[PDB]
Amino acid sequence: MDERDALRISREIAGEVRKAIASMPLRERVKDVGMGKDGTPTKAADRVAEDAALEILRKERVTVVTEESGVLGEGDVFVALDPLDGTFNATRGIPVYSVSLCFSYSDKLKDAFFGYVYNLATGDEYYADSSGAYRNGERIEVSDAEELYCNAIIYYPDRKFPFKRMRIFGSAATELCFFADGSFDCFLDIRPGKMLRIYDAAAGVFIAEKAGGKVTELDGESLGNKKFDMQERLNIVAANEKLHPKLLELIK
Amino acid sequence: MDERDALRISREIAGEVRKAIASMPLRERVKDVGMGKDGTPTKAADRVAEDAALEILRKERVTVVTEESGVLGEGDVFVALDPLDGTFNATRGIPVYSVSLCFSYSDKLKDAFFGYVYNLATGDEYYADSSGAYRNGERIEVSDAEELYCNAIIYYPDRKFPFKRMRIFGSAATELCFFADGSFDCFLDIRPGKMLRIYDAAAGVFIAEKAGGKVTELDGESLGNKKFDMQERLNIVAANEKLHPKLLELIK
Ligand SMILES: O=P([O-])([O-])O[C@@H]1[C@H](O)[C@H](O)[C@@H](O)[C@H](O)[C@H]1O
Ligand SMILES: O=P([O-])([O-])O[C@@H]1[C@H](O)[C@H](O)[C@@H](O)[C@H](O)[C@H]1O
Ligand SMILES: [Ca+2]
Ligand SMILES: [Ca+2]
Ligand SMILES: [Ca+2]
Ligand SMILES: [Ca+2]
């Protein structure tokens, strides 16, 4: 299965999902539909989003790990998918919530060949493959801000940082794409509770990688080990090559 | 002048400035076109939207307090104006930025008689008159649980909080409407080195209060006798009556 397969496939889910959510009223969006396979509740929006993706991913020889219903599939290709990363905003009318998909051969991130995040509010498309990282087509790349005094996304500010700006938009998959497109110089989820799963960073992380930004874990150990599994958790420190180090040191 | 004209005038300015920025590519958006009369530099998206905004207000008998052109016109009626709140977003294509407008029968916040916030990204409309606060033509109210374990907007987390969620979206006018909505449980701008100006907040402040909100300065002092000029600087703590005291002590 080509990257062109993954892209073609990915382009279908986003649209299917988009109008499934779009048609959905905020009132019929926030109600809970049960308990997804990862411990967290499940809103209607959640269900509707995942179904539309599964119905298409379903026809592909792929094993999928996803929030609402753990593992599914069998294929020799794995998908770390999130129908709706940023469910709080979506149920709020806040226009920052996306579809996340990452395509890999093996069980682990290291063998992933395609990244794709789609903002379902705006219709903004984020993707990456061997060719590169794009947003709405135009080629992107992380920023070259070399100063700790810079624009940042931080989960969560706990001390007093030397940041020019600090934002928190509530959709890790999308904000990693904000880091990816140079709109932001560093992504940071140093949350002690290590409350970040694979179907969250998977897609985002990989586009960031393509866009030219170094991305690892709290200490610096890569994300490679990471598995398309329901137990996997993580923290992230993302920045170009001249920022990541200093950004590490600053959180000791 | 009454709250019907303010709406009608505001609705027009919302149309033109919307037209203005939308057709305008991002490249130009980020363009430095000189310095504004307040320090915070003027970029093309700024200039483009003030221009559009000013072009309408000025043919009314009012004194305008705007970001770039300082104070303008004459009239017992005052208008605090943020022609583009969330410039950084507007420049990067992050769909949170608005046009903020507050009208008062005095230069005093306390005499405000109309408030208005328009998401230039989603065409989402917030306003507040004598009848109540509304969002896209619907009546909003603030949220209601006194538990600190709530959903907060806070500029900036310097310590450790008992909040369920912390978001910073970079447009205080709209964010104060996010609070006024129900979307977020509390708004807080406790930054010591104060940076909120009358125009970024007087509208939100006014829509939130009609929303059922309690906005006061850091110390719980009302924002009533707050002046419309390029010197005022604010700190804000907004929430329902019940959780407001709590937040004071929390950040006490
Ligand atoms: O809640 P969700 O919308 O499914 O996804 C959330 C977003 O990625 C958020 O940015 C992150 O910090 C949270 O940990 C995730 O749970
Ligand atoms: O610059 P501007 O976009 O007009 O207004 C800014 C926004 O309201 C932002 O939320 C706030 O944190 C800044 O302090 C303001 O300067
Ligand atoms: Ca999700
Ligand atoms: Ca998620
Ligand atoms: Ca402005
Ligand atoms: Ca402003």
Side-chain angles (χ1 to χ4, degrees), chain B residues 46 67 82-85 87 200:
Chain B
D46 293 319
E67 195 154 335
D82 204 343
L84 176 69
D85 181 68
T87 308
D200 295 333

Side-chain angles (χ1 to χ4, degrees), chain B residues 53-72:
Chain B
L54 274 213
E55 177 89 53
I56 303 134
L57 267 160
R58 290 219 90 157
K59 81 189 27 68
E60 300 285 351
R61 318 255 128 84
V62 309
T63 310
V64 163
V65 199
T66 195
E67 195 154 335
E68 255 73 42
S69 327
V71 195
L72 304 166

Side-chain angles (χ1 to χ4, degrees), chain B residues 189-249:
Chain B
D189 208 315
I190 69 206
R191 279 171 291 154
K194 312 181 47 112
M195 296 273 169
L196 249 49
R197 300 281 195 182
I198 185 36
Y199 27 85
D200 295 333
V205 169
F206 182 83
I207 292 128
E209 302 231 76
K210 289 263 173 174
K214 214 197 126 129
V215 212
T216 67
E217 173 78 39
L218 212 160
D219 32 50
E221 81 197 300
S222 238
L223 300 165
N225 280 290
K226 283 276 149 147
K227 257 145 65 237
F228 280 19
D229 62 44
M230 233 120 56
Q231 143 77 278
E232 284 287 48
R233 296 210 159 168
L234 295 201
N235 282 293
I236 290 149
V237 166
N240 59 254
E241 318 273 349
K242 281 121 138 258
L243 160 73
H244 191 256
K246 302 220 173 144
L247 311 131
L248 284 133
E249 173 256 287

Side-chain angles (χ1 to χ4, degrees), chain A residues 67 82 84-86 199-200:
Chain A
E67 199 170 290
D82 196 339
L84 178 63
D85 194 48
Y199 38 85
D200 264 328

